[PDB]
Amino acid sequence: SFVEMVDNLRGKSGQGYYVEMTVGSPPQTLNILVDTGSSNFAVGAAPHPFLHRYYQRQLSSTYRDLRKGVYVPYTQGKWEGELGTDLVSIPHGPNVTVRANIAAITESDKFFINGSNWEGILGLAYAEIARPDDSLEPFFDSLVKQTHVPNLFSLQLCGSVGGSMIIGGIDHSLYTGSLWYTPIRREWYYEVIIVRVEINGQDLKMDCKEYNYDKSIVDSGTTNLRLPKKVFEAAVKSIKAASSTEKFPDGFWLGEQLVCWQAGTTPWNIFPVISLYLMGEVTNQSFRITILPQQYLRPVEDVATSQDDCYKFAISQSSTGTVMGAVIMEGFYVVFDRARKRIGFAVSACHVHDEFRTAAVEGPFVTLDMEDCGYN
Numbered sequence: 001s002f003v004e005m006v007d008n009l010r011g012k013s014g015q016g017y018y019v020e021m022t023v024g025s026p027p028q029t030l031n032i033l034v035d036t037g038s039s040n041f042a043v044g045a046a047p048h049p050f051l052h053r054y055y056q057r058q059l060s061s062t063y064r065d066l067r068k069g070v071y072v073p074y075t076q077g078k079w080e081g082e083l084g085t086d087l088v089s090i091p092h093g094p095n096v097t098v099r100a101n102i103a104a105i106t107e108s109d110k111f112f113i114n115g116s117n118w119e120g121i122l123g124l125a126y127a128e129i130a131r132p133d134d135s136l137e138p139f140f141d142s143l144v145k146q147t148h149v150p151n152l153f154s155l156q157l158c159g160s161v162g163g164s165m166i167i168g169g170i171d172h173s174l175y176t177g178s179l180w181y182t183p184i185r186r187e188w189y190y191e192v193i194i195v196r197v198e199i200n201g202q203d204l205k206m207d208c209k210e211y212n213y214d215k216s217i218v219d220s221g222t223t224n225l226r227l228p229k230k231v232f233e234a235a236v237k238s239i240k241a242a243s244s245t246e247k248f249p250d251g252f253w254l255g256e257q258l259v260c261w262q263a264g265t266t267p268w269n270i271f272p273v274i275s276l277y278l279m280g281e282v283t284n285q286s287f288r289i290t291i292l293p294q295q296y297l298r299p300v301e302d303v304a305t306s307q308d309d310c311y312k313f314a315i316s317q318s319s320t321g322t323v324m325g326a327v328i329m330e331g332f333y334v335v336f337d338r339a340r341k342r343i344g345f346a347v348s349a350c351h352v353h354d355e356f357r358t359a360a361v362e363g364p365f366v367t368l369d370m371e372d373c374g375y376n
């Protein structure tokens, strides 16, 4: 019955993907950002310049105050509010209702995005990183505990944008080829291990621990591919060399300045493909996902009145490990198989197009000593 969940996601470029939910009795409708990088379910519950609607606890007969405060500091953005529980449903999701923890957001700073069209966030990761602490049961744990929904979900994020969140299973009509699985290293973030990196077929040749320093996570709430300082520098250097045929302001490589070309003349060919190899399911085995420039050059509306094609560099430097954000996930079907502690990747039905190249998930590869790639 997964067909009812196909295309249940919407979004705007650089502004996340959201699903429709209802909270309270009678049901109040809200759009909720889908975030595999956090574990709190939180909604605007007070007026805000960027909110067109919000959760009104006073109007819900099933609302229960937990009489505890809470705050969450993200990389960028934070909010604080009051904890409580209430009934929650997903109209274009499984046909169930659950009582879940909800953080009612009363104050925030750089959390809500002007024009994003979402009013809350659904953290889909594990209790370990929930605030105030791991005793606050995350939404998906409540869903699985209270219903017969199987303990997994999958995300098809498509390149204003749409996608699918299949709750409780895998919809085989949403991908082509085979699914390749990498272990979830530890259940807090969706942490994985990258074992090799190549750019246009050239190995970066770093200690693979550098790729996962201090962790690597799959995070739908983050837009960019984010890379640890040393890896970022090596990657940009290689990407610059490959595209040196053209000139870019260095504010572009910092993800600040956008670059434009005459509509339809974007020189895709001069930008390399990036291959990330992930730890596999059997001994000394891995697989790779290959990312095209159409993924890491994010389309942005022209600052000028011109109808050029403009882009921002969507790879940026991190001090908290690798983050495989939305631009990596786009064009792949990603299965969060919590039941079997693994994450699967397959080429998405809405895969990214290139004239002479194609995003891919390929294996098996042999890779020795993969355990040594994890950072401790």
Ligand SMILES: COC[C@@H](Oc1cc(C[C@@H]2C[S@@](=O)C[C@H](NCc3cccc(C(C)(C)C)c3)[C@H]2O)cc(F)c1N)C(F)(F)F
Residues within 6 Å of the ligand: 014, 015, 016, 017, 033, 035, 037, 038, 039, 072, 073, 074, 075, 076, 077, 078, 110, 111, 112, 113, 116, 129, 130, 219, 220, 221, 222, 223
């Ligand atoms: C520019 O934003 C676009 C972004 O909007 C937001 C998205 C988030 C979710 C964040 C995005 S970034 O902060 C990484 C983080 N995941 C890893 C992480 C890093 C630090 C702390 C935590 C804990 C929550 C576990 C404590 C988790 C993730 O959840 C928070 C926000 F405010 C905004 N606006 C959009 F629109 F989704 F693309």
